[PDB]
PDB file of all heavy atoms in Angstrom:
ATOM      1  N   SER A 114     -66.922 -11.256  -0.711  1.00 59.01           N
ATOM      2  CA  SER A 114     -68.158 -10.991  -1.380  1.00 59.01           C
ATOM      3  C   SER A 114     -68.505  -9.479  -1.127  1.00 59.01           C
ATOM      4  O   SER A 114     -67.651  -8.647  -1.483  1.00 59.01           O
ATOM      5  CB  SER A 114     -69.178 -11.996  -0.991  1.00 59.01           C
ATOM      6  OG  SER A 114     -70.478 -11.862  -1.682  1.00 59.01           O
ATOM      7  N   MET A 115     -69.613  -9.243  -0.445  1.00 58.09           N
ATOM      8  CA  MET A 115     -69.971  -7.784  -0.173  1.00 58.09           C
ATOM      9  C   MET A 115     -68.912  -7.268   0.764  1.00 58.09           C
ATOM     10  O   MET A 115     -68.553  -6.002   0.625  1.00 58.09           O
ATOM     11  CB  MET A 115     -71.383  -7.714   0.342  1.00 58.09           C
ATOM     12  CG  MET A 115     -72.432  -7.651  -0.767  1.00 58.09           C
ATOM     13  SD  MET A 115     -73.983  -7.157  -0.061  1.00 58.09           S
ATOM     14  CE  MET A 115     -74.972  -7.718  -1.437  1.00 58.09           C
ATOM     15  N   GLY A 116     -68.339  -7.999   1.643  1.00 57.19           N
ATOM     16  CA  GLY A 116     -67.182  -7.646   2.469  1.00 57.19           C
ATOM     17  C   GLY A 116     -65.975  -7.324   1.623  1.00 57.19           C
ATOM     18  O   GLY A 116     -65.127  -6.332   2.094  1.00 57.19           O
ATOM     19  N   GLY A 117     -65.834  -7.887   0.455  1.00 58.33           N
ATOM     20  CA  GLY A 117     -64.765  -7.554  -0.526  1.00 58.33           C
ATOM     21  C   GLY A 117     -65.001  -6.238  -1.192  1.00 58.33           C
ATOM     22  O   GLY A 117     -64.051  -5.474  -1.393  1.00 58.33           O
ATOM     23  N   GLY A 118     -66.251  -5.951  -1.495  1.00 57.01           N
ATOM     24  CA  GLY A 118     -66.643  -4.610  -1.936  1.00 57.01           C
ATOM     25  C   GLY A 118     -66.304  -3.558  -0.854  1.00 57.01           C
ATOM     26  O   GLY A 118     -65.784  -2.479  -1.276  1.00 57.01           O
ATOM     27  N   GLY A 119     -66.634  -3.873   0.379  1.00 57.95           N
ATOM     28  CA  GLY A 119     -66.337  -2.991   1.545  1.00 57.95           C
ATOM     29  C   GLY A 119     -64.853  -2.710   1.658  1.00 57.95           C
ATOM     30  O   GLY A 119     -64.431  -1.522   1.817  1.00 57.95           O
ATOM     31  N   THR A 120     -64.013  -3.722   1.417  1.00 54.77           N
ATOM     32  CA  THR A 120     -62.556  -3.712   1.316  1.00 54.77           C
ATOM     33  C   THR A 120     -62.148  -2.618   0.295  1.00 54.77           C
ATOM     34  O   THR A 120     -61.393  -1.680   0.631  1.00 54.77           O
ATOM     35  CB  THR A 120     -61.912  -5.078   1.107  1.00 54.77           C
ATOM     36  OG1 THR A 120     -62.238  -5.883   2.196  1.00 54.77           O
ATOM     37  CG2 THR A 120     -60.440  -5.101   0.853  1.00 54.77           C
ATOM     38  N   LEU A 121     -62.653  -2.698  -0.950  1.00 52.06           N
ATOM     39  CA  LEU A 121     -62.429  -1.731  -2.065  1.00 52.06           C
ATOM     40  C   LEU A 121     -62.720  -0.293  -1.605  1.00 52.06           C
ATOM     41  O   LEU A 121     -61.853   0.585  -1.720  1.00 52.06           O
ATOM     42  CB  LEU A 121     -63.059  -2.106  -3.287  1.00 52.06           C
ATOM     43  CG  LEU A 121     -62.473  -3.287  -3.977  1.00 52.06           C
ATOM     44  CD1 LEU A 121     -63.370  -3.857  -5.066  1.00 52.06           C
ATOM     45  CD2 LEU A 121     -61.049  -2.872  -4.465  1.00 52.06           C
ATOM     46  N   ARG A 122     -63.994  -0.108  -1.064  1.00 52.49           N
ATOM     47  CA  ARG A 122     -64.439   1.274  -0.700  1.00 52.49           C
ATOM     48  C   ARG A 122     -63.501   1.814   0.397  1.00 52.49           C
ATOM     49  O   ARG A 122     -63.118   3.022   0.344  1.00 52.49           O
ATOM     50  CB  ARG A 122     -65.881   1.204  -0.186  1.00 52.49           C
ATOM     51  CG  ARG A 122     -66.435   2.551   0.257  1.00 52.49           C
ATOM     52  CD  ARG A 122     -66.456   3.549  -0.892  1.00 52.49           C
ATOM     53  NE  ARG A 122     -67.506   3.161  -1.875  1.00 52.49           N
ATOM     54  CZ  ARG A 122     -67.753   3.734  -3.058  1.00 52.49           C
ATOM     55  NH1 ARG A 122     -66.958   4.703  -3.471  1.00 52.49           N
ATOM     56  NH2 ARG A 122     -68.751   3.336  -3.792  1.00 52.49           N
ATOM     57  N   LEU A 123     -63.226   1.071   1.472  1.00 50.36           N
ATOM     58  CA  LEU A 123     -62.400   1.553   2.582  1.00 50.36           C
ATOM     59  C   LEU A 123     -61.080   1.885   2.071  1.00 50.36           C
ATOM     60  O   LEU A 123     -60.512   2.977   2.376  1.00 50.36           O
ATOM     61  CB  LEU A 123     -62.418   0.591   3.711  1.00 50.36           C
ATOM     62  CG  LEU A 123     -61.668   1.056   5.034  1.00 50.36           C
ATOM     63  CD1 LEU A 123     -62.271   2.366   5.500  1.00 50.36           C
ATOM     64  CD2 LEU A 123     -61.682   0.018   6.093  1.00 50.36           C
ATOM     65  N   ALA A 124     -60.444   0.973   1.254  1.00 48.83           N
ATOM     66  CA  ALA A 124     -59.108   1.221   0.644  1.00 48.83           C
ATOM     67  C   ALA A 124     -59.166   2.479  -0.122  1.00 48.83           C
ATOM     68  O   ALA A 124     -58.192   3.299   0.018  1.00 48.83           O
ATOM     69  CB  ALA A 124     -58.753   0.075  -0.273  1.00 48.83           C
ATOM     70  N   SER A 125     -60.226   2.708  -0.845  1.00 47.85           N
ATOM     71  CA  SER A 125     -60.409   3.959  -1.740  1.00 47.85           C
ATOM     72  C   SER A 125     -60.258   5.240  -0.896  1.00 47.85           C
ATOM     73  O   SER A 125     -59.774   6.245  -1.402  1.00 47.85           O
ATOM     74  CB  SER A 125     -61.693   3.991  -2.474  1.00 47.85           C
ATOM     75  OG  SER A 125     -61.559   4.971  -3.415  1.00 47.85           O
ATOM     76  N   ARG A 126     -60.655   5.179   0.394  1.00 45.68           N
ATOM     77  CA  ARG A 126     -60.704   6.429   1.207  1.00 45.68           C
ATOM     78  C   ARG A 126     -59.686   6.382   2.351  1.00 45.68           C
ATOM     79  O   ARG A 126     -59.592   7.356   3.049  1.00 45.68           O
ATOM     80  CB  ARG A 126     -62.231   6.556   1.575  1.00 45.68           C
ATOM     81  CG  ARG A 126     -62.613   5.642   2.705  1.00 45.68           C
ATOM     82  CD  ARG A 126     -63.878   6.384   3.367  1.00 45.68           C
ATOM     83  NE  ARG A 126     -64.227   5.687   4.615  1.00 45.68           N
ATOM     84  CZ  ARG A 126     -65.229   4.799   4.712  1.00 45.68           C
ATOM     85  NH1 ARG A 126     -65.933   4.590   3.644  1.00 45.68           N
ATOM     86  NH2 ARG A 126     -65.467   4.252   5.838  1.00 45.68           N
ATOM     87  N   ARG A 127     -58.878   5.304   2.460  1.00 46.84           N
ATOM     88  CA  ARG A 127     -57.838   5.169   3.461  1.00 46.84           C
ATOM     89  C   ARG A 127     -56.490   4.767   2.839  1.00 46.84           C
ATOM     90  O   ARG A 127     -56.067   3.702   3.008  1.00 46.84           O
ATOM     91  CB  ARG A 127     -58.256   4.275   4.632  1.00 46.84           C
ATOM     92  CG  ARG A 127     -59.430   4.737   5.436  1.00 46.84           C
ATOM     93  CD  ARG A 127     -59.113   5.814   6.487  1.00 46.84           C
ATOM     94  NE  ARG A 127     -57.959   5.413   7.265  1.00 46.84           N
ATOM     95  CZ  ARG A 127     -57.964   4.720   8.427  1.00 46.84           C
ATOM     96  NH1 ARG A 127     -59.161   4.427   9.009  1.00 46.84           N
ATOM     97  NH2 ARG A 127     -56.782   4.455   9.051  1.00 46.84           N
ATOM     98  N   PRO A 128     -55.875   5.715   2.118  1.00 47.53           N
ATOM     99  CA  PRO A 128     -54.650   5.407   1.347  1.00 47.53           C
ATOM    100  C   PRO A 128     -53.511   5.111   2.293  1.00 47.53           C
ATOM    101  O   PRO A 128     -52.428   4.816   1.807  1.00 47.53           O
ATOM    102  CB  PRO A 128     -54.453   6.656   0.520  1.00 47.53           C
ATOM    103  CG  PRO A 128     -55.074   7.803   1.317  1.00 47.53           C
ATOM    104  CD  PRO A 128     -56.369   7.111   1.849  1.00 47.53           C
ATOM    105  N   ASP A 129     -53.713   5.291   3.617  1.00 44.67           N
ATOM    106  CA  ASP A 129     -52.727   4.983   4.753  1.00 44.67           C
ATOM    107  C   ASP A 129     -52.689   3.501   4.995  1.00 44.67           C
ATOM    108  O   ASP A 129     -51.697   2.991   5.503  1.00 44.67           O
ATOM    109  CB  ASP A 129     -53.021   5.769   5.962  1.00 44.67           C
ATOM    110  CG  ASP A 129     -54.445   5.506   6.511  1.00 44.67           C
ATOM    111  OD1 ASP A 129     -55.382   5.793   5.803  1.00 44.67           O
ATOM    112  OD2 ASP A 129     -54.544   4.999   7.637  1.00 44.67           O
ATOM    113  N   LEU A 130     -53.717   2.710   4.546  1.00 43.89           N
ATOM    114  CA  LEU A 130     -53.693   1.223   4.787  1.00 43.89           C
ATOM    115  C   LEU A 130     -52.508   0.664   4.010  1.00 43.89           C
ATOM    116  O   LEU A 130     -52.236   1.203   2.935  1.00 43.89           O
ATOM    117  CB  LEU A 130     -54.969   0.631   4.376  1.00 43.89           C
ATOM    118  CG  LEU A 130     -56.209   1.092   5.201  1.00 43.89           C
ATOM    119  CD1 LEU A 130     -57.398   0.376   4.581  1.00 43.89           C
ATOM    120  CD2 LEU A 130     -56.021   0.817   6.662  1.00 43.89           C
ATOM    121  N   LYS A 131     -51.912  -0.352   4.522  1.00 42.28           N
ATOM    122  CA  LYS A 131     -50.695  -1.014   3.850  1.00 42.28           C
ATOM    123  C   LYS A 131     -51.245  -2.078   2.842  1.00 42.28           C
ATOM    124  O   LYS A 131     -50.400  -2.398   2.002  1.00 42.28           O
ATOM    125  CB  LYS A 131     -49.950  -1.773   4.922  1.00 42.28           C
ATOM    126  CG  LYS A 131     -49.244  -0.849   6.010  1.00 42.28           C
ATOM    127  CD  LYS A 131     -48.594   0.355   5.356  1.00 42.28           C
ATOM    128  CE  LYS A 131     -47.603   0.931   6.260  1.00 42.28           C
ATOM    129  NZ  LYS A 131     -46.981   2.162   5.568  1.00 42.28           N
ATOM    130  N   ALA A 132     -52.420  -2.633   3.021  1.00 41.62           N
ATOM    131  CA  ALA A 132     -52.936  -3.689   2.070  1.00 41.62           C
ATOM    132  C   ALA A 132     -54.427  -3.802   2.135  1.00 41.62           C
ATOM    133  O   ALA A 132     -55.018  -3.532   3.227  1.00 41.62           O
ATOM    134  CB  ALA A 132     -52.309  -5.037   2.370  1.00 41.62           C
ATOM    135  N   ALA A 133     -54.973  -4.333   1.003  1.00 40.40           N
ATOM    136  CA  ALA A 133     -56.393  -4.688   0.846  1.00 40.40           C
ATOM    137  C   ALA A 133     -56.543  -5.961   0.056  1.00 40.40           C
ATOM    138  O   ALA A 133     -55.931  -6.021  -1.056  1.00 40.40           O
ATOM    139  CB  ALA A 133     -57.101  -3.489   0.170  1.00 40.40           C
ATOM    140  N   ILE A 134     -57.383  -6.906   0.465  1.00 38.04           N
ATOM    141  CA  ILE A 134     -57.528  -8.187  -0.261  1.00 38.04           C
ATOM    142  C   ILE A 134     -58.993  -8.451  -0.325  1.00 38.04           C
ATOM    143  O   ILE A 134     -59.545  -9.138   0.588  1.00 38.04           O
ATOM    144  CB  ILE A 134     -56.721  -9.334   0.362  1.00 38.04           C
ATOM    145  CG1 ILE A 134     -55.304  -8.882   0.653  1.00 38.04           C
ATOM    146  CG2 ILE A 134     -56.864 -10.554  -0.483  1.00 38.04           C
ATOM    147  CD1 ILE A 134     -54.351  -9.983   1.217  1.00 38.04           C
ATOM    148  N   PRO A 135     -59.741  -7.989  -1.397  1.00 36.60           N
ATOM    149  CA  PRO A 135     -61.090  -8.392  -1.627  1.00 36.60           C
ATOM    150  C   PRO A 135     -61.110  -9.834  -2.265  1.00 36.60           C
ATOM    151  O   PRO A 135     -60.313 -10.028  -3.168  1.00 36.60           O
ATOM    152  CB  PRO A 135     -61.619  -7.318  -2.671  1.00 36.60           C
ATOM    153  CG  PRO A 135     -60.630  -6.278  -2.617  1.00 36.60           C
ATOM    154  CD  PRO A 135     -59.280  -6.989  -2.343  1.00 36.60           C
ATOM    155  N   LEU A 136     -61.917 -10.650  -1.660  1.00 33.82           N
ATOM    156  CA  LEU A 136     -62.054 -12.111  -2.042  1.00 33.82           C
ATOM    157  C   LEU A 136     -63.486 -12.263  -2.678  1.00 33.82           C
ATOM    158  O   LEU A 136     -64.497 -12.036  -1.958  1.00 33.82           O
ATOM    159  CB  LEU A 136     -61.913 -12.957  -0.796  1.00 33.82           C
ATOM    160  CG  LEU A 136     -60.769 -12.619   0.084  1.00 33.82           C
ATOM    161  CD1 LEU A 136     -60.990 -13.191   1.448  1.00 33.82           C
ATOM    162  CD2 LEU A 136     -59.450 -13.187  -0.520  1.00 33.82           C
ATOM    163  N   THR A 137     -63.480 -12.659  -3.951  1.00 35.08           N
ATOM    164  CA  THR A 137     -64.729 -12.832  -4.788  1.00 35.08           C
ATOM    165  C   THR A 137     -65.581 -11.547  -4.492  1.00 35.08           C
ATOM    166  O   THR A 137     -66.786 -11.750  -4.044  1.00 35.08           O
ATOM    167  CB  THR A 137     -65.378 -14.194  -4.543  1.00 35.08           C
ATOM    168  OG1 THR A 137     -65.916 -14.383  -3.275  1.00 35.08           O
ATOM    169  CG2 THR A 137     -64.419 -15.326  -4.819  1.00 35.08           C
ATOM    170  N   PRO A 138     -65.051 -10.329  -4.708  1.00 34.93           N
ATOM    171  CA  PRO A 138     -65.792  -9.186  -4.289  1.00 34.93           C
ATOM    172  C   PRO A 138     -67.089  -9.039  -5.094  1.00 34.93           C
ATOM    173  O   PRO A 138     -67.043  -9.408  -6.295  1.00 34.93           O
ATOM    174  CB  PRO A 138     -64.849  -8.049  -4.564  1.00 34.93           C
ATOM    175  CG  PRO A 138     -63.833  -8.616  -5.608  1.00 34.93           C
ATOM    176  CD  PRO A 138     -63.767 -10.056  -5.205  1.00 34.93           C
ATOM    177  N   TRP A 139     -68.110  -8.494  -4.452  1.00 39.24           N
ATOM    178  CA  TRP A 139     -69.303  -7.943  -5.011  1.00 39.24           C
ATOM    179  C   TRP A 139     -69.370  -6.481  -4.670  1.00 39.24           C
ATOM    180  O   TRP A 139     -69.362  -6.136  -3.449  1.00 39.24           O
ATOM    181  CB  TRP A 139     -70.484  -8.732  -4.526  1.00 39.24           C
ATOM    182  CG  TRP A 139     -71.731  -8.431  -5.201  1.00 39.24           C
ATOM    183  CD1 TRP A 139     -72.364  -9.135  -6.216  1.00 39.24           C
ATOM    184  CD2 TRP A 139     -72.655  -7.342  -4.921  1.00 39.24           C
ATOM    185  NE1 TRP A 139     -73.555  -8.566  -6.574  1.00 39.24           N
ATOM    186  CE2 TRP A 139     -73.750  -7.461  -5.773  1.00 39.24           C
ATOM    187  CE3 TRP A 139     -72.647  -6.285  -3.997  1.00 39.24           C
ATOM    188  CZ2 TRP A 139     -74.787  -6.526  -5.808  1.00 39.24           C
ATOM    189  CZ3 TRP A 139     -73.682  -5.392  -4.001  1.00 39.24           C
ATOM    190  CH2 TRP A 139     -74.774  -5.517  -4.927  1.00 39.24           C
ATOM    191  N   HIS A 140     -69.654  -5.608  -5.652  1.00 38.97           N
ATOM    192  CA  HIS A 140     -69.977  -4.121  -5.387  1.00 38.97           C
ATOM    193  C   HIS A 140     -70.575  -3.659  -6.700  1.00 38.97           C
ATOM    194  O   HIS A 140     -70.051  -3.979  -7.817  1.00 38.97           O
ATOM    195  CB  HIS A 140     -68.662  -3.371  -5.059  1.00 38.97           C
ATOM    196  CG  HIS A 140     -68.960  -2.083  -4.381  1.00 38.97           C
ATOM    197  ND1 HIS A 140     -69.835  -1.096  -4.890  1.00 38.97           N
ATOM    198  CD2 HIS A 140     -68.565  -1.555  -3.229  1.00 38.97           C
ATOM    199  CE1 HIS A 140     -69.875  -0.087  -4.106  1.00 38.97           C
ATOM    200  NE2 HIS A 140     -69.095  -0.310  -3.038  1.00 38.97           N
ATOM    201  N   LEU A 141     -71.689  -2.888  -6.602  1.00 38.35           N
ATOM    202  CA  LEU A 141     -72.346  -2.227  -7.775  1.00 38.35           C
ATOM    203  C   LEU A 141     -71.379  -1.318  -8.444  1.00 38.35           C
ATOM    204  O   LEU A 141     -71.485  -1.074  -9.620  1.00 38.35           O
ATOM    205  CB  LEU A 141     -73.645  -1.482  -7.238  1.00 38.35           C
ATOM    206  CG  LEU A 141     -74.758  -2.395  -6.900  1.00 38.35           C
ATOM    207  CD1 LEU A 141     -75.980  -1.522  -6.464  1.00 38.35           C
ATOM    208  CD2 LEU A 141     -75.116  -3.317  -8.099  1.00 38.35           C
ATOM    209  N   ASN A 142     -70.474  -0.722  -7.722  1.00 39.43           N
ATOM    210  CA  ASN A 142     -69.407   0.155  -8.310  1.00 39.43           C
ATOM    211  C   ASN A 142     -68.305  -0.699  -8.803  1.00 39.43           C
ATOM    212  O   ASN A 142     -67.848  -1.606  -8.100  1.00 39.43           O
ATOM    213  CB  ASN A 142     -68.837   1.197  -7.248  1.00 39.43           C
ATOM    214  CG  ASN A 142     -67.763   1.964  -7.892  1.00 39.43           C
ATOM    215  OD1 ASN A 142     -67.920   2.449  -9.031  1.00 39.43           O
ATOM    216  ND2 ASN A 142     -66.665   2.126  -7.201  1.00 39.43           N
ATOM    217  N   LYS A 143     -67.807  -0.335  -9.994  1.00 36.90           N
ATOM    218  CA  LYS A 143     -66.682  -1.014 -10.730  1.00 36.90           C
ATOM    219  C   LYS A 143     -65.524  -0.095 -10.860  1.00 36.90           C
ATOM    220  O   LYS A 143     -64.413  -0.537 -11.342  1.00 36.90           O
ATOM    221  CB  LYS A 143     -67.178  -1.425 -12.052  1.00 36.90           C
ATOM    222  CG  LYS A 143     -67.924  -2.744 -12.141  1.00 36.90           C
ATOM    223  CD  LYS A 143     -69.374  -2.619 -11.645  1.00 36.90           C
ATOM    224  CE  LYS A 143     -69.675  -3.571 -10.529  1.00 36.90           C
ATOM    225  NZ  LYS A 143     -70.559  -4.714 -10.887  1.00 36.90           N
ATOM    226  N   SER A 144     -65.619   1.119 -10.397  1.00 36.76           N
ATOM    227  CA  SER A 144     -64.595   2.209 -10.707  1.00 36.76           C
ATOM    228  C   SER A 144     -63.788   2.595  -9.413  1.00 36.76           C
ATOM    229  O   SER A 144     -64.375   3.215  -8.517  1.00 36.76           O
ATOM    230  CB  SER A 144     -65.269   3.344 -11.273  1.00 36.76           C
ATOM    231  OG  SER A 144     -64.253   4.207 -11.746  1.00 36.76           O
ATOM    232  N   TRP A 145     -62.528   2.159  -9.349  1.00 38.56           N
ATOM    233  CA  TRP A 145     -61.689   2.286  -8.057  1.00 38.56           C
ATOM    234  C   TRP A 145     -60.431   3.015  -8.534  1.00 38.56           C
ATOM    235  O   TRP A 145     -59.375   2.577  -8.151  1.00 38.56           O
ATOM    236  CB  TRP A 145     -61.494   0.930  -7.490  1.00 38.56           C
ATOM    237  CG  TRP A 145     -62.731   0.282  -7.183  1.00 38.56           C
ATOM    238  CD1 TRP A 145     -63.285  -0.794  -7.856  1.00 38.56           C
ATOM    239  CD2 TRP A 145     -63.662   0.552  -6.082  1.00 38.56           C
ATOM    240  NE1 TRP A 145     -64.433  -1.224  -7.247  1.00 38.56           N
ATOM    241  CE2 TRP A 145     -64.702  -0.391  -6.213  1.00 38.56           C
ATOM    242  CE3 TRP A 145     -63.641   1.515  -5.089  1.00 38.56           C
ATOM    243  CZ2 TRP A 145     -65.823  -0.337  -5.288  1.00 38.56           C
ATOM    244  CZ3 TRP A 145     -64.756   1.498  -4.174  1.00 38.56           C
ATOM    245  CH2 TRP A 145     -65.819   0.536  -4.319  1.00 38.56           C
ATOM    246  N   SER A 146     -60.619   4.162  -9.178  1.00 40.06           N
ATOM    247  CA  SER A 146     -59.511   4.824  -9.875  1.00 40.06           C
ATOM    248  C   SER A 146     -58.752   5.722  -8.805  1.00 40.06           C
ATOM    249  O   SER A 146     -57.740   6.273  -9.187  1.00 40.06           O
ATOM    250  CB  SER A 146     -59.893   5.608 -11.002  1.00 40.06           C
ATOM    251  OG  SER A 146     -60.801   6.633 -10.581  1.00 40.06           O
ATOM    252  N   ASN A 147     -59.195   5.644  -7.573  1.00 38.71           N
ATOM    253  CA  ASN A 147     -58.475   6.405  -6.498  1.00 38.71           C
ATOM    254  C   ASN A 147     -57.693   5.519  -5.542  1.00 38.71           C
ATOM    255  O   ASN A 147     -57.059   6.041  -4.626  1.00 38.71           O
ATOM    256  CB  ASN A 147     -59.595   7.134  -5.630  1.00 38.71           C
ATOM    257  CG  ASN A 147     -58.877   8.195  -4.851  1.00 38.71           C
ATOM    258  OD1 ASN A 147     -57.996   8.856  -5.373  1.00 38.71           O
ATOM    259  ND2 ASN A 147     -59.138   8.311  -3.570  1.00 38.71           N
ATOM    260  N   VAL A 148     -57.755   4.178  -5.720  1.00 40.06           N
ATOM    261  CA  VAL A 148     -57.076   3.241  -4.772  1.00 40.06           C
ATOM    262  C   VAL A 148     -55.557   3.209  -4.913  1.00 40.06           C
ATOM    263  O   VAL A 148     -55.061   2.897  -6.028  1.00 40.06           O
ATOM    264  CB  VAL A 148     -57.669   1.808  -4.800  1.00 40.06           C
ATOM    265  CG1 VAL A 148     -56.864   0.795  -4.086  1.00 40.06           C
ATOM    266  CG2 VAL A 148     -59.160   1.849  -4.512  1.00 40.06           C
ATOM    267  N   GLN A 149     -54.849   3.586  -3.871  1.00 42.03           N
ATOM    268  CA  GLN A 149     -53.357   3.685  -3.754  1.00 42.03           C
ATOM    269  C   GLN A 149     -52.795   2.571  -2.816  1.00 42.03           C
ATOM    270  O   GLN A 149     -51.647   2.294  -2.872  1.00 42.03           O
ATOM    271  CB  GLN A 149     -53.103   5.035  -3.080  1.00 42.03           C
ATOM    272  CG  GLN A 149     -53.580   6.227  -3.897  1.00 42.03           C
ATOM    273  CD  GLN A 149     -53.025   7.566  -3.301  1.00 42.03           C
ATOM    274  OE1 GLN A 149     -51.964   7.656  -2.755  1.00 42.03           O
ATOM    275  NE2 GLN A 149     -53.848   8.634  -3.465  1.00 42.03           N
ATOM    276  N   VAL A 150     -53.640   1.932  -2.132  1.00 40.63           N
ATOM    277  CA  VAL A 150     -53.257   0.838  -1.139  1.00 40.63           C
ATOM    278  C   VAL A 150     -53.025  -0.393  -1.991  1.00 40.63           C
ATOM    279  O   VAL A 150     -53.822  -0.640  -2.885  1.00 40.63           O
ATOM    280  CB  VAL A 150     -54.424   0.476  -0.188  1.00 40.63           C
ATOM    281  CG1 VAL A 150     -54.101  -0.594   0.756  1.00 40.63           C
ATOM    282  CG2 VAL A 150     -55.030   1.759   0.482  1.00 40.63           C
ATOM    283  N   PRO A 151     -51.835  -1.097  -1.753  1.00 39.77           N
ATOM    284  CA  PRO A 151     -51.579  -2.373  -2.421  1.00 39.77           C
ATOM    285  C   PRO A 151     -52.741  -3.356  -2.327  1.00 39.77           C
ATOM    286  O   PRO A 151     -53.108  -3.803  -1.236  1.00 39.77           O
ATOM    287  CB  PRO A 151     -50.281  -2.800  -1.792  1.00 39.77           C
ATOM    288  CG  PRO A 151     -49.614  -1.552  -1.346  1.00 39.77           C
ATOM    289  CD  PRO A 151     -50.778  -0.664  -0.892  1.00 39.77           C
ATOM    290  N   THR A 152     -53.277  -3.744  -3.481  1.00 41.00           N
ATOM    291  CA  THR A 152     -54.569  -4.446  -3.506  1.00 41.00           C
ATOM    292  C   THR A 152     -54.455  -5.761  -4.313  1.00 41.00           C
ATOM    293  O   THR A 152     -54.051  -5.690  -5.447  1.00 41.00           O
ATOM    294  CB  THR A 152     -55.659  -3.600  -4.081  1.00 41.00           C
ATOM    295  OG1 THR A 152     -55.828  -2.468  -3.251  1.00 41.00           O
ATOM    296  CG2 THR A 152     -57.025  -4.390  -4.234  1.00 41.00           C
ATOM    297  N   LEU A 153     -54.768  -6.904  -3.683  1.00 42.86           N
ATOM    298  CA  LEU A 153     -54.820  -8.180  -4.337  1.00 42.86           C
ATOM    299  C   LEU A 153     -56.204  -8.605  -4.376  1.00 42.86           C
ATOM    300  O   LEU A 153     -56.831  -8.749  -3.299  1.00 42.86           O
ATOM    301  CB  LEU A 153     -54.040  -9.241  -3.534  1.00 42.86           C
ATOM    302  CG  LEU A 153     -54.199 -10.660  -3.932  1.00 42.86           C
ATOM    303  CD1 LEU A 153     -53.754 -10.867  -5.295  1.00 42.86           C
ATOM    304  CD2 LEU A 153     -53.477 -11.636  -2.953  1.00 42.86           C
ATOM    305  N   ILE A 154     -56.762  -8.724  -5.585  1.00 42.75           N
ATOM    306  CA  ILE A 154     -58.192  -9.241  -5.735  1.00 42.75           C
ATOM    307  C   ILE A 154     -58.150 -10.717  -6.180  1.00 42.75           C
ATOM    308  O   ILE A 154     -57.447 -11.007  -7.138  1.00 42.75           O
ATOM    309  CB  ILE A 154     -58.966  -8.346  -6.814  1.00 42.75           C
ATOM    310  CG1 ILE A 154     -59.184  -6.928  -6.328  1.00 42.75           C
ATOM    311  CG2 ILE A 154     -60.342  -8.993  -7.187  1.00 42.75           C
ATOM    312  CD1 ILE A 154     -59.708  -6.028  -7.303  1.00 42.75           C
ATOM    313  N   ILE A 155     -58.799 -11.525  -5.426  1.00 41.99           N
ATOM    314  CA  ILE A 155     -59.033 -12.944  -5.744  1.00 41.99           C
ATOM    315  C   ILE A 155     -60.410 -13.158  -6.274  1.00 41.99           C
ATOM    316  O   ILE A 155     -61.441 -12.905  -5.573  1.00 41.99           O
ATOM    317  CB  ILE A 155     -58.770 -13.862  -4.477  1.00 41.99           C
ATOM    318  CG1 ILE A 155     -57.363 -13.486  -3.974  1.00 41.99           C
ATOM    319  CG2 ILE A 155     -59.010 -15.330  -4.861  1.00 41.99           C
ATOM    320  CD1 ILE A 155     -56.823 -14.525  -3.026  1.00 41.99           C
ATOM    321  N   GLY A 156     -60.480 -13.571  -7.493  1.00 42.55           N
ATOM    322  CA  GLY A 156     -61.694 -13.893  -8.162  1.00 42.55           C
ATOM    323  C   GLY A 156     -61.897 -15.396  -8.286  1.00 42.55           C
ATOM    324  O   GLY A 156     -60.930 -16.099  -8.146  1.00 42.55           O
ATOM    325  N   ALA A 157     -63.099 -15.828  -8.604  1.00 42.23           N
ATOM    326  CA  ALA A 157     -63.393 -17.336  -8.741  1.00 42.23           C
ATOM    327  C   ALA A 157     -63.943 -17.523 -10.191  1.00 42.23           C
ATOM    328  O   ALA A 157     -65.008 -16.950 -10.461  1.00 42.23           O
ATOM    329  CB  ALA A 157     -64.325 -17.782  -7.690  1.00 42.23           C
ATOM    330  N   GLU A 158     -63.222 -18.172 -11.023  1.00 38.33           N
ATOM    331  CA  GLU A 158     -63.548 -18.354 -12.476  1.00 38.33           C
ATOM    332  C   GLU A 158     -65.080 -18.641 -12.653  1.00 38.33           C
ATOM    333  O   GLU A 158     -65.645 -17.963 -13.505  1.00 38.33           O
ATOM    334  CB  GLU A 158     -62.757 -19.456 -13.159  1.00 38.33           C
ATOM    335  CG  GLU A 158     -63.097 -19.641 -14.647  1.00 38.33           C
ATOM    336  CD  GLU A 158     -62.258 -20.786 -15.207  1.00 38.33           C
ATOM    337  OE1 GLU A 158     -61.715 -21.546 -14.493  1.00 38.33           O
ATOM    338  OE2 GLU A 158     -62.311 -20.891 -16.495  1.00 38.33           O
TER     339      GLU A 158
END
């Protein structure tokens, strides 16, 4: 949730991380055009 948003932000600024997995992420920002870290987003229909 908001922890998932935190996952996206940290991934955005730490391209040295090997992976990021936001789970049902919440973040007011929708734009992650700088993320280089392999990222799996799990959403809930």
